[PDB]
Design a protein around this ligand. Sequence first.
Ligand SMILES: *P(=O)(O)OCC(C)(C)[C@H](O)C(=O)NCCC(=O)NCCSC(=O)CCCCCCCCCCCCC
Ligand code: SF4
Ligand code: SF4
Ligand code: FES
Ligand SMILES: [Zn+2]
Lengths: 427, 122, 67, 118, 711, 154
Amino acid sequence: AEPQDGFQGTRLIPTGADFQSPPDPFIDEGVDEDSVEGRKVRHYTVNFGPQHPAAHGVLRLILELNGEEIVRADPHVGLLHRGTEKLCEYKTYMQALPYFDRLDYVSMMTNEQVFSLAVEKLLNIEIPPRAKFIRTMFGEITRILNHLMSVLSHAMDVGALTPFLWGFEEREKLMEFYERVSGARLHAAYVRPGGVHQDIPVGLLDDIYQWATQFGDRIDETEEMLTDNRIWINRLKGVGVVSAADALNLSFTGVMLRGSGVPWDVRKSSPYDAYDQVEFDVPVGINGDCYDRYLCRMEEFRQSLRIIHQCLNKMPAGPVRYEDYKITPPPRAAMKENMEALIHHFLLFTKGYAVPPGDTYTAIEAPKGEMGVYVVSDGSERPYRVHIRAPGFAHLSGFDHITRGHLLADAVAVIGTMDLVFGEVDR
Amino acid sequence: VQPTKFAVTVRQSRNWADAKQRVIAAYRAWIRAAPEIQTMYSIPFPVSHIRTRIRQEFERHRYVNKLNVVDVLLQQSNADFQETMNFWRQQSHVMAFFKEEHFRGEKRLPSNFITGFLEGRN
Amino acid sequence: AHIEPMWHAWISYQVDTPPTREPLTQIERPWAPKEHVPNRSFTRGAYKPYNTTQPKIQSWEPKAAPR
Amino acid sequence: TGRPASAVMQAPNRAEVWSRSQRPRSEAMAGPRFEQTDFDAQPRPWAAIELIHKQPVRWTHDRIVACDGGGGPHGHPKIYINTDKPEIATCNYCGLPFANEHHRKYLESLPQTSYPLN
Amino acid sequence: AEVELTIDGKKVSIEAGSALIQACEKAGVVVPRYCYHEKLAIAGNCRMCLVEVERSPKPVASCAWPVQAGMVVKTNSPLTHKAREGVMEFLLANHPLDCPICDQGGECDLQDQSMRYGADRGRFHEIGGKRAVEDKNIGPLIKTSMNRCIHCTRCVRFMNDIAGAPELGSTGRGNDLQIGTYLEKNLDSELSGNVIDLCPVGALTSKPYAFRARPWELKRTESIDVLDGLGSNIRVDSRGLEVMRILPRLNDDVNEEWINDKTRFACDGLKTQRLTMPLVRRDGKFEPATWEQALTEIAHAYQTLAPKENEFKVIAGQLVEVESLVAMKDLANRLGSENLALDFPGGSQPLAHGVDIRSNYLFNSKIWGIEEADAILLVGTNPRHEAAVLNARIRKQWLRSDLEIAAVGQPWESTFDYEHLGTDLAALKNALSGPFGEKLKKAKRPMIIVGSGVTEHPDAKAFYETVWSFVEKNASNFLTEEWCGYNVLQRAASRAGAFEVGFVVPSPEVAATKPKFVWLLGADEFDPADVPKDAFIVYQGHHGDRGAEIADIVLPGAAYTEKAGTYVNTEGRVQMTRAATGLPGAARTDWKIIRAVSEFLGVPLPYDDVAQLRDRMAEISPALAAYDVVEPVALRHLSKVQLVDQNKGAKVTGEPLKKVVENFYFTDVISRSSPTMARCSAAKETGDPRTNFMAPGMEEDRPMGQIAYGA
Amino acid sequence: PRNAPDYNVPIDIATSTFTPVPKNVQDGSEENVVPAGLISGAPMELQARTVRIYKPAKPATQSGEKNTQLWRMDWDVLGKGHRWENPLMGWQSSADFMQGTHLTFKTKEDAIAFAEKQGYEYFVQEPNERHFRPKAYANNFLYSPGKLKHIRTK
Ligand SMILES: *P(=O)(O)OCC(C)(C)[C@H](O)C(=O)NCCC(=O)NCCSC(=O)CCCCCCCCCCCCC
Ligand code: SF4
Ligand code: SF4
Ligand code: FES
Ligand SMILES: [Zn+2]
């Protein structure tokens, strides 16, 4: 009878240390004196951060060092915890969507994809084919955008500075497509429950194809500088090595999961949007190290480009927005001409749409790993509880287990191979 | 203390003899540490003022007769001890525990009826 | 901020027709500004906000009756 | 404050307030913040109320007239105005004047009218 | 009896003779409606309640379909679904696209039930256009945007049946049918503002609350009306520190979904002439002062006078809560004074009814007792002006039953037929023994309502023993186990509470002593003879009115919208107001002003938290601890000793019973400060139907407009 | 001592010039109730202010009753600190940290249990319900043997 039976402490909660079991004695794999062996060694602590690159903006990781090697790594996060999950309870569902742009701020339209897919699942609606392809095309444009940040900032930390500038022109060109569909270079707010906010402009699919014709040459020259370079190879081989069993036990997803030899992509295993309609491959590494995770990320550049070209050729016609004004806003022209449309316009922008009661956990294959949201609905127009599962939050939690015994110059390489934007980690 | 210097695995008091043993060991560590807290955080108070103020924070929960309530009050103490003994709390958090470094000071509720009436509820 | 607004769209590749052939600039608007005012911060002409509404509660204007 | 005319006159076109809860610029731009200040640089838009009443009446032979604001989908929601009272009927969204041709004789005989009427 | 039936499978137990929509409500089933209102007659015009009934080829209107012993009702069948979409398509075909400019936006039943039972898009695109209708001038309070009318008939039913004001109608035919007086007229009814709440759509809106707020931005507080003695339950909607509007909340025991116009529009008088700082009269001019040195000059003046027993006098106004009565009662007692007067004339002398038995001064057959009244005698009361919502409840019973009403007093313009017996006391003695008396003697549940306006009549002692001696002569009909035909009707929200705590003059001796010091505690309707000119006057209140004009000190208290005061309504129900906003300026809670001046005069009243002051109120009267309930009077027969025994030798003078309400619009200080009541009086007087009568808007003689509201 | 405000309560960091003086602060000893306000980390001011537990009344403006179905717990407004006018923009400033917070509960006893668990002062308001009365369309056309005393107009 908790909490009443807990007043006197008549019951003790069975801790995991109660259910510990001795290892089997037979098949089990592997003091004080005048000598200096008994002598102890002092350690000193070091305050690492903030580094120059934008993604690792608020990292205060405190390392304990035995000489040069890392004994224990304690990241202190929360320096960009802004209370998103609470502010989302006082907003309608449409009002809460811009909060998702600002979680992983280098992968915006895939953050708002997982929130739309979660709300759409509770709405029990099927979004039209055109928005399905628009979302899968701009989800791969987003994946290229994030990898341009992640791979090139990683090599900028490792000390290669030129690939960073080349691919940020490629980034500079691919944000023109964000600003044409929406009016934002960073926070589009374009992907919304029921499809997309507005139809793509009438010359964009030609301009993406023109960009497509040359983007592989950009990967090849970026690959000219890093892949076979012995300095690059000797700074990532054997660094940050995680076993396949431990990556699962550590809650690793994405290339952190995939670089240790586990074939697993949410797009292939729980297909969403138009991913079941596109042919693409999944790079899976061997040795579980930073060099494998670099080679897996470069291969995804070429695979995302291969999806974008397929999306251009299968772009169907029709609404880009769920054809129901109780859920998605009516056209401006309808609202200014038809009675029912102005009523549905008015109520969607003041009260919002009601979501039926229930809860759903929805995950997508985000560029930094698996990104998921747990949404409790109360049947009303505001979410009762929004919880974001951020791939980097679980990755930074396993930084101590992975950097243990490494050098600090090794740990800076481990920070970049884990795709870490701290607005994602702190929500 | 495996992951951090002052870490203590979360434990559930077995009975009142155990629960009082832990409280006294918590109080002992805090008042032991008061000289170390007063130099790191440059507290412009006597170590005696720090110790008498540490005592007040235990004196608040002296009448708790629930064993489930003591463990959460003990875990809160242990966590506060860990973030103070590691230089994780800023001087601003620590010397903000002393409720006289407000520009209104310790006197922040009205003293009686009339003085709070003439000041509009303080 | 010295660029006049309709030319600002041209210089930004937001239109292809310059304001020299765009009919939208040939609308007569007597309220429209006569000269181009640039960004006027950092100067004594900087914009100063104020309340536009009246005070909410009107107080009694004391009138003592004669004795 | 006070000395410049822009600090004193509520709008360039109008001198007085046009709602009961509007603050006069004389009282809004008094105080310390408006010292060492250029009042001719201050934002002072033309008052819409004066401009709308300079609008000529649309004469019509119909009982119900339709107003969409005058720009197709660039106006306001299309509504319908009844012009059966011997007055000038005005669109609730934009303020434009409408009047039935039957009331032209009466309307032309009034001394002061809320719209130019020609 | 009870029929049983199934609606969507589930059995509901509803009385025979009720409509299906009533059983659908009881069964937990939501049925869309526009025309049907629980408190209005059934009309089957909207067609939004069409449900599928077994053994019926057509959909039936559930609102008008009586429940039968075995029927089956499907409310979610495909018959029902296409019925509701078809009606929602018709209701929106000619509806104006005026939701951004409509005041009903965000709280509209047409919008919500279009979102829930209609189609998502519309199929009306006629080049011929929509219907459009001209606006109608029906008085100052109501603004009309008639294009929005959906022809529910809710307001014509309310105005014709509840308000008894049959000037609203429905002229025309077909699509050109229109709601409004054919010839422009000012709707003359103290209940007319209820039409605005009843309207499903914004075709009837309030001119004061014209475009100021959206419903979503309003904080809602459930409080009490104190502008009358009935204690009507309301909702105070406020945006920050300004009250926006006052709406009616349901309480079938008191006001039943209805409020009068005074209690709905006087809230603009809460931001106009407020006392916000202490004032001291210096050289004939009121100077601002602080609290520490206005309470000081209270004490210094009191020490200088050194008043004797009962020389310190209090007069309690008509908006005063019970907490400050008990506190001022104490501070009065510690000063040797029992001089506890009341605002009305005759309130500084003892009252003809006592305060010893609670049943002496209460509406004993509670407000709900009218619902079964058979004969009613009204004595000294124009109930249409003194208690508007109560007056409506009398007419509702009259219109549906064989109710006989007779009145002794001044004839008034009544919404129900009544026999007029006379105007003076003899015309009561001659009536009570005349033909109408046997109606009271014969009819079960008889009801005699004695207006609080006779308490101030000089002959009240004779009036009150005349009434009760008839009641005592006619018990077992007037004084049964569950009935009491004796009822005294308060018109100010403070009187029943003052009587409950004994805040009255006890004896003629204390009444004749001249005071040197008068505390006008929110008192503004005092007779000049009850305040000696040379006395020292403290005014404690919230509005600058007559009371502050004569004060030597002015102390700003709180209005009823920013205090949680206790009030007792005329039936004896103890209700609590909820503060909707905070105190303006330097005002202070009223009971706290008393408690502080206890320190400055050296007799500090013990309690210094309001919880303690409610414990003290419990000692004076335990009923004051019971909230939202009437406590029945046990010794109801003991009332003879005050009404008849202590009223035996009465000096009858023969003066006729007087009207108490010269202006229904100008009764209190909140009302008199209200611009909206200013327009209501001026429109009443000059008979102006124009909505923009002293308001913003274009006119024939204002082509240019006007920014004055209320002038 | 019988509703006496403990003027000597030890304040905390969030205590202000708007915090009222409490009467009772959860000691952690009261029987059958968890002293959640003692271990919540909330300020002492939560234990001084009263909350109202009530069922919201249906709007007079409309006939939907969805919002009347659940009990709401909200904090009472104080005489100072709830709203004041911003001198600069005319906005409404506040010191009341509870002004926009409300709680929803399925039953009255669920709200009372939470209030006592947190040490709130609470006033419960009992719902106002209707009085059932059979309504019949047929009455609109009942026959009057005598004077009409009413001209029904649909
Ligand atoms: P004695 O037998 O009289 O008393 C012994 C005790 C107190 C155990 C009682 O017998 C008892 O049973 N009391 C109830 C149990 C109890 O005390 N529960 C709570 C214990 S934990 C606690 O009180 C934590 C207090 C706060 C800890 C931190 C204090 C210092 C923080 C700030 C320092 C200065 C700034 C850095
Ligand atoms: S009445 Fe309702 S539906 Fe009609 S315009 Fe107003 S808000 Fe819209
Ligand atoms: S004015 Fe309003 S209440 Fe009256 S009939 Fe029209 S819609 Fe119904
Ligand atoms: S609800 Fe029965 S027809 Fe309107
Ligand atoms: Zn228009």
